[PDB]
Amino acid sequence: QACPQPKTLDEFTIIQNLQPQYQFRDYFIATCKQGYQLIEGNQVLHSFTAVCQDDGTWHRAMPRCKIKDCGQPRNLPNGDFRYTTTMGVNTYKARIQYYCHEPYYKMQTRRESEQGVYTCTAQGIWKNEQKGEKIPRCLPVCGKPVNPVEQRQR
Amino acid sequence: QACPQPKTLDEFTIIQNLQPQYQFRDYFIATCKQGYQLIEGNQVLHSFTAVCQDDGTWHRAMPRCKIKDCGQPRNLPNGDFRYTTTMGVNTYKARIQYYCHEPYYKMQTRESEQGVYTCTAQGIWKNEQKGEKIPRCLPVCGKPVNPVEQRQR
Amino acid sequence: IIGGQKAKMGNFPWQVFTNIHGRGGGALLGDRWILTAAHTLYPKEHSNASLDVFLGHTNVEELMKLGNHPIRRVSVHPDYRQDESYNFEGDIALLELENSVTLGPNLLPICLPDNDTFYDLGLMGYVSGFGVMEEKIAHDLRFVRLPVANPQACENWLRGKNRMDVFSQNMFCAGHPSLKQDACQGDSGGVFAVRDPNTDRWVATGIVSWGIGCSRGYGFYTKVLNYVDWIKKEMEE
Amino acid sequence: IIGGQKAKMGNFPWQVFTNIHGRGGGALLGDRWILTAAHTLYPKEHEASLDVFLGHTNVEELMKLGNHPIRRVSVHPDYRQDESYNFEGDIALLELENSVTLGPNLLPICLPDNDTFYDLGLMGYVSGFGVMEEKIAHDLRFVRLPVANPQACENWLRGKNRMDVFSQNMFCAGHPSLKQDACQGDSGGVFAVRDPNTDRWVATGIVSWGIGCSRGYGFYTKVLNYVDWIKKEMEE
C-alpha cells in the first residue's frame, strides 16, 4: 500500500525529512529556501502537506516555490526612492534608497547615514536594518531660503 | 472695469462675504455646506479663490459642491458590516453597523450599542466613541458548539 | 488514550496534533497560540525534529490534509530540565503560529484557569488525545473522563514504588490505580480539560506530563494555574 | 513698507498674506502653521473670514494660487483686544486645515533660541505687502532695520507723553531718522534676522505697533519669549 517517492519540481523546494518508503497515513511537508514562497496554480500557500492515501496516491500534487515579491515600495510623503538594484524589480534581495526632497525637506535621523536603505527581505516585505518596516519621515527644513537676500560665500 | 457678479451653480455652494461690485484685484472664496466638497471637472478641490483680472474677467470658472463620499468601509477581520442606510451608499450621513462572527469571535468593548459608524462631514467613517479606528473582533474561549456535557434548562 | 471513546466533531475544538519527536498533543489558545508540554519539544531520553502541527479535525488523516500550521516561535518555560529524567517541573511550552487560524465550530480555543477550585478532590475532567490505545494505535481523537486525585494518595503510591520523582506544587494528579482510563504515548501535551460547573466554560487546568506506565496508576499533570501569568506574558502582543 | 524695495521670488519664502479685517502678514512655521499678530484677528477698533494666501510675491498671483483654509486659531492669553495702547501678547497662531508642499518660493522660518538675537544694532529684515509712502503695494516689499536701544525707545515715548505698554515681551527696531518702516498692511509679518553664525533665518519678532509709520521706532512682539507657547500650541 505504498506511495511514489516525492517529486521536487524546482531547486527552491525543500522536503523536510524525506523518507525512503512512504505508506498509507504517512505524510510530507514542503517548504522553500529563504526568500521563496509555495505556489499552486497562480495562488500563494502558507504551507504544504501531502498525505499518502489508501490507494497509493498522494492526496495532493506537489506545488512550486517561486521568488517572493515585496510589491511596490510605499510612497514617502515629500520624498522618493531610487533602486540600487535592477529598476522596478521588487523581488527578494532587491534594494532601494529613499530620499527626501532637499533642501526643502530633510530625512529624520538616529545610528546614522547609510540612511534610507530598504531591502526586500526573506519575509517578503521592505525593511531597513535599523528602522524595520516603518518608512522614513521627511520634515520641513526652516530658515534656508534658496534665493536669500544675503548669504555667506567663501 | 468691473467683473461679473459671482454665479452659484448649485444649492450647496457658499460665497463668503459676497460683494455688490467686484473690480480689478478683488477676489471671492467659494466653500460648501457641511458634508459637501468643491469639484472642478473630475477633480476635488481643497479651496477656491477667483481673482478679478484687469480685463473684467474672473481668472477661473465657478466650481460645484458635490456630496462627500467616505469610500468603502474598512474590512473587519472576523467580522463584517451592514447598512442601516441605503445599501451600498457611502455618502455624507450614511450609516453602517459593524458586527463580529459570533459566537466564535466577540467585539472588543468599552457604551453599547456602538459598532455604529456614520459617514461624517469630514468624509471619513467615524464612531462616536471610537473615532476612525475600526472595531476589533477577539477569539471566544471555552464555548464549544458541540460540547460533550453542557447545562440545560 | 486508554479506556476511552471516539471524540465527535466539535467536542474538543481546541485539540492540537503535533508530530515533533513522535506524536503529541496541545491546546489552541486565542487564534494563534498553542499550549503544550515542554518534554514534547525537548524529550528526556533522546533523529532531528520538525515543528509539525495540525488542527481542526478529529480524524488524523483529515487533520493532515487540512495542512500543517507553521510555527513562528517557541517558548519553553525556564524551570524545565531536559537532562533530568525524573523531574518534569515546568513541563510546559508555548508555540506561536506564523499565521492565526480562522475560528469555527470545529476550531476554538480553551480558556485558562483563574482560581484553585479547578483542582478540588474528585472534580471530573476530560483528557482527549491521539495517543495509543490499550491494544492498538488510534486513527481518530479519543477521550476519557478522569477524577482529580488526592495528592497525598499520589505521594503514597510513588512511595510504595520507591520512586523519587519530583512531585511539586506545580503539578497535580488525576485518575486512580483502579481505573483503566489514562493518557498514553502520544497524548502528552494535551490538556486536562474541566467544564466549569458554574459557567459552562471549558478550561485547561493541566497538561498531560508524566506517569509510571499508562493504565491503572495515577497520571501527573502540569498545574496550568501556576503558569497563567507566564503564559499571558508570552502572549503579550 | 515705506522706503524699501521689491522682494524677489525666494527672498522671503515664509511670507504670508492675510486678509481678515484688512490686509496683513504672517510667516510660515513648519508646513501647516502661521505665526502672526493677535491684533490682525482681533483689532483694537474694530468694535471677517480667515483668508490666507501663500507662496508668491505678487498679490494677484498669491490670490490665484488660492486660499488656504484655517482649521484652528490660537491667540495668546495675554492679548487684550479692548485696551488701546496695550499690545502685550500680540501674537497668535493659525493652523492650516492642510499642510502646504514646500518649494523654493515656500519655506518656513526658524524660531529663536537665545537673547543675542536682540542685541543693540543687529540688522534684520521686515517684508510686507503693506502700504508704501505714496502708493498701494501690489508686490512684496522689504526693508532692513537695526534693532534699537530699548532705553531710547522709552525716551522717545516719554518725549511724546505716551502711556503705551512697552514690556519685556516687546523690542524696538528702526530709528526716528530712518525712513524705513512697517506700515498699514504689514502687521503680523515677522522681523527676520539672519543668524551670522549659522546662515539660518529666524523670526525674532512680529510687526505689532507704532506711532504712525515712518521716522519713529517700530515695536515688535519679542518672539523668543513665546517659543515655549508656540511649541505647545503646535503639538495638540
Side-chain angles (χ1 to χ4, degrees), chain A residues 2-10 12-20 22-32 34-41 43-63 65 67-109 115-128 132-133 135-154, chain B residues 1-20 22 24-32 34-38 40-41 44-65 67-92 94-105 107-110 113 115-127 131-132 134-135 137-142 144-153, chain C residues 1-5 7 9-44 49-71 73-82 84-135 137-179 181-232 234-235, chain D residues 1-5 7 9-44 46 48-134 136-231 233-234:
Chain A
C3 273
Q5 209 64 358
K7 39 320 147 161
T8 212
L9 302 174
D10 63 64
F12 302 113
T13 304
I14 300 164
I15 293 165
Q16 293 181 336
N17 310 306
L18 185 61
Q19 297 303 297
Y22 275 106
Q23 337 138 83
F24 175 48
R25 305 186 192 286
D26 271 17
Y27 75 83
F28 78 95
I29 299 188
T31 183
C32 310
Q34 255 25 216
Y36 289 73
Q37 63 192 179
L38 300 161
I39 302 183
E40 173 184 74
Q43 290 180 224
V44 163
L45 303 173
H46 297 333
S47 64
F48 180 83
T49 301
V51 176
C52 178
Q53 303 180 119
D54 61 15
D55 58 352
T57 64
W58 290 111
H59 91 294
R60 229 170 136 183
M62 257 270 218
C65 291
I67 204 179
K68 284 173 166 164
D69 190 279
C70 297
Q72 186 81 14
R74 282 225 325 287
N75 173 72
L76 177 45
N78 302 300
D80 216 334
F81 58 96
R82 66 180 67 85
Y83 290 87
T84 292
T85 255
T86 312
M87 294 287 201
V89 175
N90 302 319
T91 52
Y92 176 56
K93 311 164 291 149
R95 284 195 33 187
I96 55 178
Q97 173 164 58
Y98 282 105
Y99 56 94
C100 294
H101 297 139
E102 296 250 54
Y104 315 121
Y105 294 86
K106 180 175 190 164
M107 182 164 311
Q108 190 178 54
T109 51
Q115 203 170 209
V117 169
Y118 287 73
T119 85
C120 176
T121 57
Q123 305 160 327
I125 61 209
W126 295 103
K127 297 192 178 193
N128 159 287
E133 181 169 357
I135 65 177
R137 187 166 165 72
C138 294
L139 301 178
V141 167
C142 75
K144 285 191 170 320
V146 315
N147 191 14
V149 167
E150 55 194 32
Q151 63 158 157
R152 57 189 193 185
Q153 298 305 339
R154 70 199 67 209
Chain B
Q1 174 181 315
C3 273
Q5 204 66 348
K7 55 287 192 214
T8 253
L9 303 170
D10 58 59
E11 354 172 321
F12 299 104
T13 295
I14 289 178
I15 290 168
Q16 291 192 336
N17 311 292
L18 185 71
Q19 296 301 296
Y22 285 100
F24 168 49
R25 304 174 181 284
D26 282 355
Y27 76 85
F28 74 90
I29 309 184
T31 56
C32 309
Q34 259 204 300
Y36 288 72
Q37 67 189 178
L38 298 158
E40 159 175 281
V44 160
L45 305 187
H46 284 343
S47 69
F48 185 87
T49 299
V51 179
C52 179
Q53 298 172 296
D54 62 17
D55 57 6
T57 66
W58 295 110
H59 89 287
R60 219 174 139 176
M62 254 273 173
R64 266 163 169 86
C65 288
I67 194 156
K68 278 159 146 179
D69 193 297
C70 286
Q72 187 75 5
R74 291 190 59 87
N75 275 300
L76 180 54
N78 303 301
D80 212 332
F81 58 100
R82 60 180 75 89
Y83 290 86
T84 299
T85 252
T86 325
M87 176 67 125
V89 172
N90 306 319
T91 58
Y92 174 53
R95 264 202 44 171
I96 54 164
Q97 170 159 67
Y98 281 108
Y99 63 86
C100 292
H101 294 149
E102 296 254 41
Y104 316 129
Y105 303 77
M107 186 162 304
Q108 190 176 44
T109 58
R110 298 81 178 178
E113 301 302 323
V116 174
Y117 286 70
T118 63
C119 168
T120 66
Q122 301 163 358
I124 57 194
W125 297 103
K126 295 204 294 195
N127 190 265
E132 185 172 356
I134 71 174
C137 297
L138 304 175
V140 170
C141 71
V145 311
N146 195 18
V148 162
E149 56 183 33
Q150 87 171 132
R151 50 171 194 199
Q152 231 75 238
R153 78 210 56 227
Chain C
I1 296 293
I2 299 183
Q5 301 165 61
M9 282 269 66
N11 293 164
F12 307 92
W14 49 79
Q15 175 70 54
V16 176
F17 180 115
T18 62
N19 175 41
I20 308 172
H21 302 259
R23 214 173 260 206
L28 186 62
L29 304 177
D31 65 350
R32 82 182 272 132
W33 292 90
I34 294 151
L35 188 58
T36 185
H39 80 258
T40 277
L41 303 168
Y42 294 96
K44 294 307 194 186
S50 214
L51 288 192
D52 298 348
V53 177
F54 302 97
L55 297 188
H57 209 285
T58 56
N59 171 270
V60 177
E61 172 174 4
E62 283 304 331
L63 275 169
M64 291 167 178
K65 288 186 179 184
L66 281 175
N68 61 293
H69 293 259
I71 298 313
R73 210 243 283 197
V74 184
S75 307
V76 172
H77 188 272
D79 287 327
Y80 183 75
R81 298 285 175 265
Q82 199 181 198
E84 314 193 5
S85 286
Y86 305 100
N87 170 25
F88 289 73
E89 175 70 17
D91 185 17
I92 183 168
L94 212 51
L95 311 182
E96 192 187 4
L97 296 183
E98 180 74 51
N99 309 299
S100 58
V101 297
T102 297
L103 305 192
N106 305 310
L107 190 58
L108 288 178
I110 192 160
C111 310
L112 295 168
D114 57 314
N115 86 95
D116 201 42
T117 64
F118 289 109
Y119 302 94
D120 284 355
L121 169 61
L123 184 58
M124 294 299 304
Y126 292 79
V127 178
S128 61
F130 305 95
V132 131
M133 298 168 70
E134 195 192 342
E135 313 215 346
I137 282 165
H139 304 316
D140 305 82
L141 192 68
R142 309 181 69 87
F143 73 95
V144 287
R145 170 151 188 275
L146 301 158
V148 176
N150 192 336
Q152 169 181 5
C154 291
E155 284 277 1
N156 194 78
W157 178 79
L158 289 178
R159 191 185 152 198
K161 288 183 154 287
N162 274 293
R163 292 286 298 254
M164 302 283 274
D165 303 56
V166 172
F167 175 32
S168 83
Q169 63 180 342
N170 303 296
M171 304 166 185
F172 69 104
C173 62
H176 193 264
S178 66
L179 291 182
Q181 287 88 294
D182 206 353
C184 210
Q185 183 49 224
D187 293 307
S188 287
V191 297
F192 180 96
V194 170
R195 182 178 74 83
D196 188 334
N198 293 297
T199 234
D200 210 47
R201 278 178 18 250
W202 289 72
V203 188
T205 70
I207 299 183
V208 173
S209 183
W210 69 274
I212 308 196
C214 280
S215 216
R216 293 289 222 94
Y218 291 106
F220 298 78
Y221 300 71
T222 307
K223 199 189 225 225
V224 174
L225 174 67
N226 296 355
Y227 304 89
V228 173
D229 286 344
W230 177 84
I231 295 160
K232 282 181 186 322
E234 301 289 314
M235 293 182 56
Chain D
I1 303 306
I2 298 190
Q5 302 168 70
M9 284 276 59
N11 293 161
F12 308 96
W14 50 82
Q15 174 76 49
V16 183
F17 181 101
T18 65
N19 181 36
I20 311 165
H21 307 274
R23 193 176 276 196
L28 179 70
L29 304 176
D31 66 354
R32 68 186 285 124
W33 297 87
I34 285 153
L35 183 66
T36 198
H39 79 261
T40 192
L41 297 180
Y42 296 93
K44 301 298 197 169
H46 289 67
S49 302
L50 289 177
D51 300 355
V52 169
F53 302 90
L54 296 183
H56 210 277
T57 54
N58 173 271
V59 171
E60 173 179 19
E61 287 281 5
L62 269 174
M63 295 177 171
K64 296 177 159 173
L65 282 178
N67 58 308
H68 299 258
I70 296 315
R71 157 163 131 72
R72 176 181 45 165
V73 165
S74 291
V75 175
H76 190 270
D78 289 342
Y79 184 74
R80 296 284 175 282
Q81 197 178 183
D82 292 302
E83 20 185 315
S84 222
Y85 294 103
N86 177 17
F87 286 84
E88 181 67 25
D90 183 7
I91 186 164
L93 211 68
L94 310 192
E95 190 192 4
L96 293 184
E97 181 66 56
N98 301 306
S99 58
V100 292
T101 298
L102 305 186
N105 309 297
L106 185 61
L107 306 163
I109 192 163
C110 302
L111 291 169
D113 66 334
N114 81 90
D115 198 40
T116 56
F117 288 109
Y118 303 91
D119 275 356
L120 181 49
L122 186 52
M123 300 294 297
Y125 295 74
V126 179
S127 50
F129 301 104
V131 130
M132 296 167 56
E133 193 181 325
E134 301 194 338
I136 285 166
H138 303 311
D139 303 91
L140 194 53
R141 296 177 85 81
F142 74 93
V143 284
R144 180 165 177 267
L145 291 179
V147 179
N149 191 329
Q151 167 168 10
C153 297
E154 279 279 342
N155 191 71
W156 177 70
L157 297 159
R158 201 170 60 90
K160 297 177 156 276
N161 288 294
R162 293 288 300 237
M163 302 289 253
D164 297 61
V165 177
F166 178 27
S167 80
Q168 86 205 322
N169 297 304
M170 310 169 187
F171 73 100
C172 51
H175 189 267
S177 65
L178 293 176
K179 195 174 99 176
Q180 287 82 331
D181 206 347
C183 209
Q184 201 153 255
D186 296 322
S187 289
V190 298
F191 190 91
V193 177
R194 189 180 69 81
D195 188 328
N197 295 310
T198 262
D199 206 44
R200 283 172 17 233
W201 292 69
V202 188
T204 61
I206 294 170
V207 178
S208 182
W209 69 274
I211 308 194
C213 281
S214 204
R215 297 283 230 94
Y217 285 109
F219 294 80
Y220 295 74
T221 310
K222 188 157 179 164
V223 174
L224 174 59
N225 295 0
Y226 300 93
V227 162
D228 284 351
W229 178 84
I230 293 163
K231 282 144 92 144
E233 290 295 311
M234 289 223 308

